[PDB]
Amino acid sequence: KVLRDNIQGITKPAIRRLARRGGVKRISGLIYEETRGVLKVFLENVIRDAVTYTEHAKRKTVTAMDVVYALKRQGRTLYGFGG
Amino acid sequence: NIQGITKPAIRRLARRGGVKRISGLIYEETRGVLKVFLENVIRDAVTYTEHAKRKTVTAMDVVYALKRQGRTLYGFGG
Amino acid sequence: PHRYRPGTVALREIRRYQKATELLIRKLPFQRLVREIAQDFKTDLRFQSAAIGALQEASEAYLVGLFEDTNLCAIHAKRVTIMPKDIQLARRIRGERA
Amino acid sequence: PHRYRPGTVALREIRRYQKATELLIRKLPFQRLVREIAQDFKTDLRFQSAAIGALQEASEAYLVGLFEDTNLCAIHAKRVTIMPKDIQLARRIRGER
Amino acid sequence: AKTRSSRAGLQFPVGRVHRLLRKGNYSERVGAGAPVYLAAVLEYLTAEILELAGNAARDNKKTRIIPRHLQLAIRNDEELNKLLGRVTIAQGGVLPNIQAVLLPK
Amino acid sequence: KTRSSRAGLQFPVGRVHRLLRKGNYSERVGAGAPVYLAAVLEYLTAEILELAGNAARDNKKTRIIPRHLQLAIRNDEELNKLLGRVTIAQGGVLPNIQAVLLPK
Amino acid sequence: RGRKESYSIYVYKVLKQVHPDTGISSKAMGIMNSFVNDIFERIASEASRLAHYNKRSTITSREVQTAVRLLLPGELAKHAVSEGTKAVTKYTSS
Amino acid sequence: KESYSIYVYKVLKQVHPDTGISSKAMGIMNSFVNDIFERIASEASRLAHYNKRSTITSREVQTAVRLLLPGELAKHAVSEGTKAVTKYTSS
DNA sequence: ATCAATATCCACCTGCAGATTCTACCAAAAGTGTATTTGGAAACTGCTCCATCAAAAGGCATGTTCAGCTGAATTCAGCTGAACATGCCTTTTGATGGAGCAGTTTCCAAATACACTTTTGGTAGAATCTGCAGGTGGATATTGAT
DNA sequence: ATCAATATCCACCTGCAGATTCTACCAAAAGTGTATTTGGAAACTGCTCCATCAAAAGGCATGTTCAGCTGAATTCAGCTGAACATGCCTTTTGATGGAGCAGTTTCCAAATACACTTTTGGTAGAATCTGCAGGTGGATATTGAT
């Protein structure tokens, strides 16, 4: 089945919740689009590297270690999945 | 000694940085940041000197030290 | 009826979501987004469940930290509403786009 | 007499020092500062001339980039004058604090 | 037969750290004191975190450390925060912190 | 009859191989790896020297100085990405005044 | 099959030392395992670089030592170097 | 004491046979070659370890270039590299 | 707008000296030929673990209304920081010349690799305790209107 | 300065999902006996590095005057938060096929290990040369004023 326009599933209320945990009280209306912008560039960058590991291992399944190595490369070191 | 970094030079640094107008409190704040910088870099560079059982900080010690801090510098050895 | 003034529930929510550690993006929509972004890179590849969970932990983590920095940029401009101008400054200083 | 309006010579200075690549801190006060700081970690240390020049290249570069980010914080707060809070915000966003 | 960990008085495996130093391609040869010293530093830092995390667990009235308590221990200690400044603790949350400017005047 | 000539390169493939074996990177070094790598280093060097030579021409000069190199790195987008955390000694900054700061 | 190692046996040992009443969830054990592996890597590779800068083919407890000095913020470094030297002298008393 | 000096001068004479290069600028090129070498070599090392491989091959160097170079710089790099390896094993 | 009078910028040519480039012979690589050793490509294959489905239910997302109060836009003055002309001194050269000291060899003792042959400590998967998650209702603050 | 209107404490209860313990294996750490190489330990140069020393020229410190920028104080259209009513779609749960990860072997092709042979890149003096730096002369940019 075809996958399209999926960044729109990052709901406006969920972007609000992320901003709350961030400590933000008032949120201008354009933020929700700006946030999705940033989020996509983040995921692209990470998934791109993550898949370069999957391809180098000649595999078809993106493993959690692939993501962990990828985040490490981007200086976003993640604990709690790493082995 | 840190007060030896004169305001006409901190002025020039902000000029190269693109700064048009400068608060008077800047110069003290700038000397503070610069001190934390040399402090961190030199502490590392000298740790490299001591490990190499030397008495002279070599330029490569400063380079390796700057790399550790993510301030990679070209033109002195690496 | 009752009515809380603009801001009171805002602060109620900051207090609430800062006390928690749950993920704030819905699992399925995030998973769809991730599979699309991956699909438009390599074709018919699988995902370990843990790798989508790693992507989501890292992503919510990233965005929440970006909101902290964004908020300080808004306060710094004597405002309380975060705007795109603020995010673009926060990222610019971080190095992420400059 | 003749006199330039406030703001004009500032932009003249920006256009000049961005055109140049010379170091902007006087060499000797800097050297004094470096050995003064190093004395606090190891005593009676000598420095390769290349290492004082490298430390100065690196730190002046650092400060110019910090001033760029500072200037942007000044602008962002509808100002033109950089203040200590601008430096403090720039460093806080960079991770240095 | 005595394990090197007990010979050095450690709970961490000195044999395993020594094996991980050769298989990791860090140096052509590995001295005999390196795995001991390293296993000691790792065991120390593990202890130092576990201490503060157990404390944070007790404060929340819990007997088992969850990722939150680990995040609390890391983020309230200045030096562990510096050491884990670019590290993200999954399921860890943030520290409660509301900017003063935003509070009910 | 060397290896660099066999690969049609100017960079030392033999020396790159020795630096890889001796760098403590892996137990064994494949035979094609140092070739491949020396090729990537030569290419990137060419790309920079090209752009910096244009900065040298454009500045009416014959000898490439650090300034021309920094102009070449920061005015080009992708080399800027690649050396974003590198400081080019004696390099200066790119001329750039924020519009907000200009007369009238 | 196939068996995969971790540090959980040792992290649990040190946990019952500092807080003998508390236990640890597996998600938090994974976070700890991640931390030991991260710091292992940081130390071993900074030490690798030390031995290489000084043209020495061997990483000794001294390389690990200044690696810790370089890499750990103070006081954590002081206390670390202390327990490390302690364990290495005690070791070499056969 | 070694350097990359004569090789940078050679490649300079290919692209710009008319122009020459300052000494400080040659040092900068040297630092650049050493840096890129380090980044690529160590990324390739990690590739090998992550997959429990014992040898660094051109396959690893390649995936290293993909990860490290912002393609399009990477596209041209991978080209220049496979090209030089193909010509090497021909002869 | 320009008219005028500062001062600033900008080429065009200039001549010398600090560096560049080019020559001229030597150890340390690097290429070569042969012999061993082996890392991981190739080929089945057990078998987790992933994609996908169905179904039901209630947790949240969507959209709409209404207005509190925030952000923007404005006016205004005190005052801070720029431009300068002034006056003095600290930085900058420039060898000079002695000396700490980073770099070199060369024995060889101590430390490490290494090749095998036992001897466990660790790990996977049963089995067996036990927090605490996620309901529940009281008491306690906290808000926000009158 | 009151009371309602709600939110947010907290403490208490209790089976179940996620620990903790209890187990045989067996991979790998440990013990021992040679083989290799390691990186100090004295012995001696040559560098670069400190250190005075001693003019000139800058480039800094400092005062004075005010242009104009930063903060404050207002005003207000309207954006964004709070509350709702609706009903969609995410979640939860449990089942099944099968792709493809990952444990085994098997066996060449490709790597390592010597051992000499051969070439190259680095040095340190010899033969150029680009560009700094300084010199007018002419448009340029800036800021006063009918």
Residue numbers in the entry:
A (entry chain F): 20 to 102
B (entry chain B): 25 to 102
C (entry chain E): 38 to 135
D (entry chain A): 38 to 134
E (entry chain C): 14 to 118
F (entry chain G): 15 to 118
G (entry chain D): 31 to 124
H (entry chain H): 34 to 124
Can I see the authors' text?
Here we demonstrate that the histone variant H3mm7 is required for skeletal muscle differentiation. We therefore analyzed the crystal structure of the nucleosome containing H3mm7. The overall structure of the H3mm7 nucleosome is quite similar to that of the H3.3 nucleosome. The crystal structure of the H3mm7 nucleosome revealed that the A57 residue of H3mm7 does not affect the nucleosome structure, but the residue is unable to form a hydrogen bond with H4 because of the absence of a hydrogen donor. The dissociation of nucleosomes was observed for both H3mm7 and H3.3S57A under conditions of 600 mM NaCl, but this dissociation was not observed in nucleosomes with H3.3 and H3.3T32I. This suggests that S57A incorporation results in unstable nucleosomes. We found that the H2A–H2B dimer became dissociated at lower temperatures (60–70 °C) in nucleosomes containing H3mm7 and the H3.3S57A mutant compared with those containing H3.3 and the H3.3T32I mutant. These results indicate that H3mm7 nucleosome stability is less than that of the H3.3 nucleosome and that the H3mm7-specific alanine residue at position 57 is fully responsible for reduced stability of the H3mm7 nucleosome. Therefore, we concluded that H3mm7 is more mobile than H3.3 in cells, probably because of unstable nucleosome formation due to the A57 residue of H3mm7. H3mm7 may enhance the levels of activated gene expression during differentiation by forming a relaxed chromatin structure.
